[PDB]
Design a protein around this nucleic acid. Structure first.
Ligand SMILES: [Mg+2]
Ligand SMILES: [Mg+2]
Ligand SMILES: [Mg+2]
Lengths: 284, 442, 442, 284
DNA sequence: ATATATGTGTATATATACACACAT
DNA sequence: TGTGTGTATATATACACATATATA
């Protein structure tokens, strides 16, 4: 029951809820008026997030922002965030001309919505029963649109959309620091539940048409191709009009974050207490 | 060491009184003609200074502040930032005088973003209503670059709602609809019975009524079924936080109601489910009274109309329409002063243009041979002690493309146009000019 | 609703890498030539913008740091205010680039007043060293109103002393005396053995001893008669608060020392008396070592010279002499660029003045007649004839008073002296002009 | 043991120690460099002082810069700041042509310095012995140049000279509030122990010489009487001054506060719940 | 017979990142 | 192992003033 939490009306219920982690109170004021009012949350952090890499959970749950993230979403350190259903019969079907191997208790990402295997079976879709020993696990785990259904959860929410500013600090010192903090629950990344809302950094309008560039590097690659324009570099999320805020909230461009096999070394390189790794990484 | 003896009576009568009266005339109590407290006047003056180059450009709210220090605002820039952030909204202002770019706050959360994100510019309302900026009175102190008070066409003080607080005095004026204020000002101009302005809060969909001089602000609620209700509106004094934490947290903790949130684009939309522990007597009047009482949908406020008159002294009004019947009268004299100033300026410009045309004709006709003489004696020569001897330096500084016949007739045309403008300004009255300036406000 | 799967490797390689390179280049590490982190050059650009009209006018620190986002600053103005407060003082600046009136802190209290109070302006040192501001490189971004880096004459980065931390890299350059940095630049310019410069701290009266890269900044003391002593100077690291609370407080509540404060106008004056419980003895060497160690009168600093070269890339040097040689090599080319630009500008101005002189001479007598003409025919006539077409603006910029006497002689003299000025620019080389400019620094 | 306090070397001992209460760290930065290291203290307040009229001596010590002042000056609420010497033999002398009646253990303010009665007697000054019953107590109480010698006391500093920003807020809102606080000991304003360190509010540089105006009211009485003045309005007490601070501290212009008979009425009118008395006060 | 909120003003203060070399 | 420097991210506290409502 933290102070600055915009609770969704189906928080503690089984629904496709989302929690938005803006980094300040100035980024939240326009979110209230543009939520889904049913599956949307909000909590303002306080600037640069504490470097969560390497500290024990006792010291980890001492910063106010990390403690409130834990209290809101229900994630507790040192314990997992959700258990999966027991493996059963494996079924293979052809979705959009692509062979897909799932179980009888999996979730399928179709048109931005997760549909149960039972629902697809009830939708007059052909299913091929395949023995478990004759199932390619490597191909099964490579499908980003397939995830296992949870038996039980404590994560009040079902999605944590990190929505920070697009300044270099917001994308470089705060985004891949909340990423490092949430790396303590790799199941969140495996299920495609940790997302980043693509907030434009530069809204360069030409004539009567507005173009959105989500990174400064994207702008510099199209600075000489677009017509004459007035660059509007938004420093923070609170510098966006209500119309643009509502458009980018109700028509979001997420970035579902997944970890590679060597994510631990990648996070140690950027967050660990060894400047030589950063020196080598930067000069390349 | 210059040990001197000082009495407490002299300290209070001089230093404590100076601050206490300064707080009245500067910290609060907005000027009746201006509608601005001094901080807001400084902010708008700086915003005009910034927008001089380009009025459509949005400037950082930090840029609007900070530079207010040189204009004569020696009171710290955070207050200037905060006062400029409260003027660019539309939820707070029924007639905003600054336009905004960014999260300037909403009715749900009534706090703007930090000054580092949000931009501000002088809105089209200021340019549409505020006229005669150059004819505004000059402040007594030389360091106060902004004028004593601007000159809006209508009394902006009864447009957005002010709440000032001072040592000994305080003010509280409720917002009024722009159309009603305009109608009242027009009636005062024509000199008939003036209808009192109607109170209308910005971005408010409810009912405001007059009861024995008070002002009861009521929300609106409907019952979708026997046990479900929809709070379509809440009184203007409430945010989403100070309404929830004041009316819905106590009710939920006591186990009376179970409320949901629907504060979407349609303002506040709380949906309330009633339990059996809450009284639901079938009497319509009693049920309505109970709902209005427990849910705080009724808010009573009374105007305390304390302003600063045109003479820079505190004045307290009683009727809602008593600023209008005095603001209109003083603004009439100010429009008359504008008319006289414009007449003088147009006469001077026409005389200068006519003398310029005459000098051009005389110099192209060989009467004044420019070649073969020094500049000093030529200035002392026939260009002096004649009809255009007052503007000898201006004529001497003439550029080249005027000896040619392309502009030789153009200068005469401009002189004739200036004479026609002067005749127009002489053939006008203060009432006609003021009622013409009012038609601009749509 | 879009769900694009992003690998963490791409996140780290793009967003984190961009942030790290940004911190290294455009936030923390100072430019080799300019010696400015890219928040100090924004402040100086804005202060120069404010100093256009009145050079000596003092501007509030909320006005300098305010409105730097229009120059291209992409961060909060509080950081700009803090950066402008550090370079506007004298206690830690061996070459103040900003002159300010107010409490900018001192060695005792190393914290300037709140930005609402202290004023600042560009000092005479900046105008004395920073030349060719208009010939400075144009930054790639169009929004970066300031140049890519200003063009000083001596390496400013070695004078004031710069310490910055970024992702993966960090810098620390000790202050160096101006009198010796100028000598080193002179030796580099002529070409000879470059003497290493001497590290000099601002408003510091002690001894800086260098052994090998390490520096051994010491303090001072003086035994009055046998046990009472006067600490006349503490190392540069200490404040007054974090010297009392660091050494003198954890020495009085231990039965070791008793101290009094005598921090006069000269500097620190912590007069100390020792009680019986002390390990002091007769031997001078151990006495001196124990006094210097216990009271922290010795501080050690080792330079880590990390600077951004003229190409915008990080560069780490091994000694200051290498930095001076590289800086003078870079500035020698910009001196030649100034020479070429001045040559072109002077040639164009000479041609303009000669065309003006020919126009005055040929219209006063009456060859080129403008009477009974229009703009189009006059312009066509002047463009058809040679040596007049490229500067048809001269036709209209002459003004009427230039069709007289006492001006043809003046304009001809101006045109003649322009030839002398162009010849002056066509003979001087880089070395002599650079030496002449260096001779004006004192 | 106050962190923010600049203790004087002779603070707590028997001397003419002085406290220099400012209203911010920005105004006290230059004090340490310019103050008399022997007898000069300093404690910066935090903005406006709490309205301390009618409050009990238990909520008064809840404001930080009203309990800290008590800690520094050693004063405690509800107890006399010091016990005066017992009355003895009374003496009269002609001081600068004025007949002054004193007692053998008072102090006399001569040329800005306080001198003991015994010292004056030892300085070849004629003293006339007068019986105690024949001494006019009304005349003695009216003498502002004579103060009783302190037999014992706790006031660490025997001066509480208040110095604040010379603007309206620091002159009419903080000065009288501190006066009302210090009125809890209605004996400090009896020996000239509460002083006001006058500070310029407006500085003009007519010619090559520097002219100081202490109050804006004083400035707006000869503003159209000076040649070519370009004022530098001073809002910060010690934050718009560089060497003027040293001049105004080493050559201070004090103003001792003396309570009239009806000081309680004035403090209730200026600092009281009834706001109608103020409206009656500023209307005349 | 208290509690409180409104909007200019008075001052300050907080947590966090980054690295490198003293100082433990 | 640990403060410490300077540019960045974001946030926050007490105090005054009065008067008309809500509460006690
Ligand atoms: Mg934000
Ligand atoms: Mg101050
Ligand atoms: Mg003050």
């Amino acid at each position: 029951k933290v102070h600055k939490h915009i609770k969704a009306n189906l928080c503690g219920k089984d629904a496709d809820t989302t929690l938005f982690l803006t980094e300040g109170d100035s980024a939240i004021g326009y979110l209230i008026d543009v939520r889904d009012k049913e599956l949307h949350g909000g909590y303002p952090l306080r600037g640069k997030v504490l470097n969560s890499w390497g500290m024990s959970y006792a010291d980890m749950l001492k910063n106010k922002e990390l403690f409130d993230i834990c209290a809101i979403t229900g994630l507790v350190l040192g314990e997992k965030a959700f258990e999966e259903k027991e493996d059963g019969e494996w079924f293979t079907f052809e979705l959009n001309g692509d062979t897909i191997i799932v179980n009888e208790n999996d979730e399928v990402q179709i048109n931005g919505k997760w549909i149960t295997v039972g629902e697809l079976r009830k939708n007059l879709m052909k299913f091929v029963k395949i023995d478990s020993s004759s199932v390619d696990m490597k191909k099964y785990k490579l499908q980003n649109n397939v995830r296992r259904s949870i038996k039980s959860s404590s994560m009040n929410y079902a999605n944590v959309a990190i929505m920070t500013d697009a300044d270099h600090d917001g994308l470089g010192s705060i985004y891949p620091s909340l990423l490092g903090f949430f790396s303590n629950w790799p199941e969140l990344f495996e299920q495609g539940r940790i997302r980043f809302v693509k907030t434009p950094v530069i809204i360069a309008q030409v004539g009567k048409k507005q173009e959105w560039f989500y990174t400064v590097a994207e702008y510099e690659s199209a600075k000489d191709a677009l017509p004459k324009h007035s660059i509007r570099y938004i420093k923070g999320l609170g510098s966006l009009e209500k119309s643009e805020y509502r458009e980018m909230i109700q028509n979001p461009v997420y970035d579902v974050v997944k970890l590679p096999e060597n994510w631990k070394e990648l996070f140690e390189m950027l967050m660990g207490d060894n400047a030589d790794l950063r020196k080598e990484w930067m000069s390349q | 060491m210059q040990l001197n003896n000082r009495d407490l009576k002299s300290i209070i009568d001089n230093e404590a009184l100076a601050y206490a009266m300064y707080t009245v005339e500067n910290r609060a109590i907005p000027n009746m003609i201006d509608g601005f407290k001094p901080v807001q006047r400084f902010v708008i003056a700086r915003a005009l200074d910034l927008a001089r180059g380009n009025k459509d450009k949005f400037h950082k709210l930090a840029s609007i502040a900070g530079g207010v220090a040189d204009l004569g605002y020696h009171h710290g820039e955070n207050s200037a930032q905060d006062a400029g952030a409260l003027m660019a909204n539309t939820w707070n202002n029924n007639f905003p005088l600054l336009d905004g770019q960014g999260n300037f706050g909403s009715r749900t959360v009534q706090k703007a973003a930090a000054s580092r994100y949000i931009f501000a510019r002088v809105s089209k309302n200021f340019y549409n209503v505020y006229k005669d900026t150059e004819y505004a009175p000059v402040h007594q102190d030389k360091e106060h670059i902004p004028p004593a008070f601007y000159l809006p066409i209508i009394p902006t003080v009864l447009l957005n709602g002010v709440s000032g607080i001072a040592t000994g005095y305080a003010t509280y004026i409720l917002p009024h609809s722009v159309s009603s204020v305009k109608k009242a000002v027009l009636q005062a101009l024509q000199g008939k019975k003036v209808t009192k302005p109607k109170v209308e809060f910005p971005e408010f969909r409810g009912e405001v009524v007059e009861i024995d001089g008070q002002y009861e602000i009521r929300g609106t609620y409907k019952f979708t079924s026997r046990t479900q209700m929809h709070i379509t509106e809440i009184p203007y004094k409430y945010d989403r936080e100070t309404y929830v934490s004041k009316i819905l947290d106590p009710l939920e903790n006591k186990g009376f109601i179970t409320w949901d949130d629907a504060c979407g684009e349609h303002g506040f939309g709380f949906k309330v489910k009633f339990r059996k522990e809450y009284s639901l007597s079938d009497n319509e009047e009693e049920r309505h009274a109970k709902i209005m009482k427990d849910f705080g949908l009724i808010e009573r406020r009374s105007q305390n109309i304390t302003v600063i008159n045109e003479k820079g002294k505190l004045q307290v009004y009683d009727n809602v329409v008593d600023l209008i019947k005095d603001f209109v009268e003083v603004r009439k004299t100010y429009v008359q002063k504008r008319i006289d100033n414009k007449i003088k300026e147009t006469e001077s410009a026409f005389r200068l243009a006519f003398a310029k045309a005459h000098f051009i004709k005389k110099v192209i006709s060989g009467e004044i041979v420019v070649q073969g003489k020094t500049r000093k004696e030529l200035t002392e020569e026939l260009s002096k002690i004649d009809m255009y001897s007052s503007y000898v330096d201006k004529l001497v500084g003439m550029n080249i493309f005027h000896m040619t016949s392309d502009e030789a007739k153009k200068l005469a045309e401009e002189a004739k146009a200036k004479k026609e403008e002067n005749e127009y300004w002489k053939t006008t009255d203060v009432v006609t000019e003021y009622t013409k300036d009012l038609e601009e406000i749509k």
